[PDB]
Each structure stands twice: as structure tokens, then as C-alpha cells.
Structure 1
Amino acid sequence: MIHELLLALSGYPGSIFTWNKRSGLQVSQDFPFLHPSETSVLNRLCRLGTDYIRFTEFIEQYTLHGIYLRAFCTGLDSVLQPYRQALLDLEQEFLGDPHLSISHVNYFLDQFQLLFPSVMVVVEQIKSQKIHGCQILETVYKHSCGGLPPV
């Protein structure tokens, strides 16, 4: 189930983690093998997966036109690189000792959980206001004076 999840957090949905076009990633229903209390933390964990999927779908779509939009997505993958790299690691730690639970996996994301949310509305302002041209170099700058150090 661990390697099952680490793919769901990568952009591949399956039977355990269904995909909905409006809401986002979420667990289907109660599962007998697992506990009924975990059905929550996963839903808290998917609030992160939905961000990466809606990210990479937009990144590929390139959608509006202009070089400053092309380069924004070109750079948007660079900030998103430590997310992937930190996800490849989780499998290595689980390959060593088979006593690690979802608690530790949820704990490992830590920084990504408080970063994506603030870098989600920056994309939404673009696709909802047709920000064409060099005006992006301000719409991203007006959000660069944020307090959150990571952002």
C-alpha cells in the first residue's frame, strides 16, 4: 500500500485513490485491512496530490500564449523539483526497515504541505484573468513580498 500511495502522490490514480475532475484526489471508502481512523490523514495527504496533478496538467497544456507564459511554466518545474526528489527518497527508507507507518510518510512531506497552497492561487489568478504579456513579472512579484520564508 506504501508503494501504492507513493504513486498516487506522483500523478497516477488507481482503485484505492480514485480521481474526480472537480474535487480532486480522495480515498474511495472504508477499507477493512487498514484502520478507519487513517481515512482522514490520507484525505489530508491528497490535498497535496491534487496540487501536483493540477500543476503538471497545466504545465503540459501550456495554457493564452506568449513567451513569458512559456518561461513561467519552464521555471515552475524547477521549484517543483525538490518535491519529486523528496518523494523518490520515501521508497528507499521503506525498502530498508518494514516497520514504518503512514504517520512517518505524512511527516516526511512537511515542507511541501505548507508551500503548494500559497503557490496555488498564483496560478489561479493567471488562468482566471487572462494575464497576458510582461504583466506576469508583476503579478508574480506582488506575491513575492509574502511573509512565508519558503514561499
Structure 2
Amino acid sequence: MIHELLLALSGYPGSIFTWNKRSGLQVSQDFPFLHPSETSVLNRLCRLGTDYIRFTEFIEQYTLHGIYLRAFCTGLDSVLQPYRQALLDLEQEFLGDPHLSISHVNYFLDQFQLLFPSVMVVVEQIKSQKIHGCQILETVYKHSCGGLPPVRSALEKILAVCHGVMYKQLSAWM
């Protein structure tokens, strides 16, 4: 279920890792090939994946309309890249050593555990208040004063791309 886990973390659930459109990723039931008090960490690890899918389900649908919103989407694709990069790194590890345990990935994947919940609610405000127009430039900036250095440096990048639209329309007009 090692390789089964990584695929579930990429957006492809299975039988052992069921999917729900309401709750999200979750362990189905008890299995005899897993420790009785181990299912805990997997559910906590699955919460990292549940955020990831709702990203893609939002990205693919692009849903509200406007260039600033659409360009904010592509800006969201850049920040998720190290998550794609770091997860792929584990593949080289287990192919090398096949006896690794489930504890190591949690020790490796702690940094992304904190970045998503702060940036995920930023999407929720947009889908719940219909933030249309240039006002998206402030909702990203209002959370840009956050305390977490990584969360600050992440939304910093989206702002560096979201302004890429304003500067163009500003230039072609002024």
C-alpha cells in the first residue's frame, strides 16, 4: 500500500483509499495488513491530499469569470509545483530501499502540512463571496501580511503573477 498511498496523494483514489465528494480522502475500514493504531496517521496524511484534489477540481473547472480570476488560477499552479516535485522524490527512495516505513513520509512532508490550510481558505473566500474584478488583488494582499514565512513567500509569488495582467492592461491603456 506504499505505492498505493502516493497515487492517492496525486489525485487517484482506490479501493483501500475511498473517495467522497463531501468529506474527502479517508481510510475505508480496518485491514489485517495494517497496524491497529496506525490508521491515525494515514487519515491525517489523507487530509493533505483532500486539499490537493479540491485544488485541481477548482483549477480544471476555472470556476465567476474574468481575466484576473483566470490568471489567478495559473498563478496557483506555480506554488503547487514543489509539492509535485517533493512527492516525486520519494519514488527514487522506495525503489532503492523497499523496506521503508510509513513514518518517514510524515517526517518528510511536514512543510506542506501547514501551507495548504492557510492558502485553501483563500479559495473559499472567493467561492463564497463572489470576489469579481480587481478586488482579488486585495484578498491575496490582505492575507499576504500573514505571519508564517512560507505562507507569506507563497502568496507573494501569486501576487507576482497576478499583477502580470494589470501591468499589461495598464500599459496598453496608458
Is the TM-score greater than 0.5? yes
- Percent identity reads 99
Map Cα deviations across residues 62-97 of structure 1 (whole Å, 9 max, x no partner). Answer: 000000011000010100000011111111111111
Q: Counterparts of 2:125 and 2:59 in 1: how far apart (Å)? A: 15
Structure number with larger C-alpha Rg: 2
For residues 38 and 78 of structure 2, the distance between their equivalents in structure 1, rounded to whole angstroms, comes to 32
Structure 1: which 4+ aligned runs deviate by more than 2 Å?
A: none
Shift of 1:99: 2.2
Q: How far is the alpha carbon of 1:136 from its aligned partner? A: 0.2
Aligned-pair CA distance for 1:41: 0.2
Structure having the higher helix fraction is 2
Deviations, residues 28-85 of structure 1 (Å, cap 9, x unaligned): 0010011111110000001100000000100011000000011000010100000011
| 2:56 is the alignment partner of 1:56 | yes
Distance 2:46 2:117 in 1: 12
How far residue 98 of structure 1 moved from its aligned partner, in angstroms, is: 1.6
Counterpart CA distance in 2 for 1:98 and 1:132 is 50
Deviation larger for 140-149 or 31-40? 31-40
SS in 2 for 1:120: helix
Q: Distance in 2 between matches of 1:105 and 1:143?
A: 29
Unaligned runs of 5+ in 1: none
- Secondary structure of the residue aligned to 2:31 is coil
Secondary structure at 1:7 match in 2: helix
- The alignment covers a number of residue pairs equal to 151
Gaps spanning 5+ residues in structure 2: where? 151-173
Question: RMSD between aligned alpha carbons?
Answer: 2.8
Question: Which secondary structure state, in structure 2, belongs to the residue aligned with residue 147 of structure 1?
Answer: coil
Q: Distance in 2 between matches of 1:37 and 1:10?
A: 25
Aligned-residue offset at 1:25:
0.3
TM-score (norm 2): 0.85
Query: Partners in 2 of 1:107 and 1:95 — Cα distance?
Result: 19
The alpha-carbon deviation at position 108 of structure 1 amounts to 1.3
